[PDB]
UniProtKB/Swiss-Prot annotation:
It comes from the Eukaryota. It comes from Homo sapiens (Human). The gene is GABARAP. The record marks 17, 28 as: Interaction with LIR (LC3 nteracting Region) motif of ATG3. Residues 36-68 are annotated as: Interaction with GABRG2. Ubiquitin-like modifier that plays a role in intracellular transport of GABA(A) receptors and its interaction with the cytoskeleton. Involved in autophagy: while LC3s are involved in elongation of the phagophore membrane, the GABARAP/GATE-16 subfamily is essential for a later stage in autophagosome maturation. Through its interaction with the reticulophagy receptor TEX264, participates in the remodeling of subdomains of the endoplasmic reticulum into autophagosomes upon nutrient stress, which then fuse with lysosomes for endoplasmic reticulum turnover. Residues 1-22 are annotated as: Interaction with beta-tubulin. GO terms for molecular function: beta-tubulin binding; GABA receptor binding; microtubule binding; phosphatidylethanolamine binding; ubiquitin protein ligase binding. The lineage of its organism: Eukaryota, Metazoa, Chordata, Craniata, Vertebrata. Residues 48-50 are annotated as: Interaction with LIR (LC3 nteracting Region) motif of ATG3. This is Gamma-aminobutyric acid receptor-associated protein.
Length: 116
C-alpha cells in the first residue's frame, strides 16, 4: 500500500502538522484513511481525520460505513501496517502502537481481508 497523502505532502511538512495536532488536541489522534487501490468500494471524501482516543474501530467502521454509504451486508476491513486491528480497540491504542515518524496513523480500508 502506498498512501497518496505521503506523495501529496512532503515529509517534513507532515511531521510538522502531526506534532501540532497532537499538541493542541492531546485527547485526539491524527489519522490518514485511504483505500486499498485494488479494493472495490467507494472512495472517501477526505483523507485526514481527528479521532478521539477512546473511539473504537467498530464505531470508526460504521462512521466509515455511512460516510461511504455501505450496507451492513458489505465487508469493510482496516489495515494498519498490513494487520487488521481488533474491532473492539481504541484509536488511541492503535496510534501509540503504529503512528509513523510524521506522527500520523495510516489506515488502509478494503472490502477484502487481504488486499493486493
Amino acid at each position: 500500500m502506498k498512501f497518496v497523502y505521503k506523495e501529496e505532502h512532503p515529509f517534513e511538512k507532515r511531521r510538522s502538522e502531526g506534532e501540532k495536532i497532537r499538541k493542541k488536541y492531546p485527547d485526539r489522534v491524527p489519522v490518514i484513511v485511504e483505500k486499498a487501490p485494488k479494493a472495490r468500494i467507494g472512495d472517501l471524501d477526505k483523507k485526514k481525520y481527528l479521532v478521539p482516543s477512546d473511539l473504537t474501530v467498530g464505531q470508526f467502521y460504521f462512521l466509515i460505513r455511512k460516510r461511504i454509504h455501505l450496507r451492513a451486508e458489505d465487508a469493510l476491513f482496516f489495515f494498519v501496517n498490513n494487520v487488521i486491528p481488533p474491532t473492539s480497540a481504541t484509536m488511541g491504542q492503535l496510534y501509540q502502537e503504529h503512528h509513523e515518524e510524521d506522527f500520523f496513523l495510516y489506515i488502509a480500508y478494503s472490502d477484502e481481508s487481504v488486499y493486493g
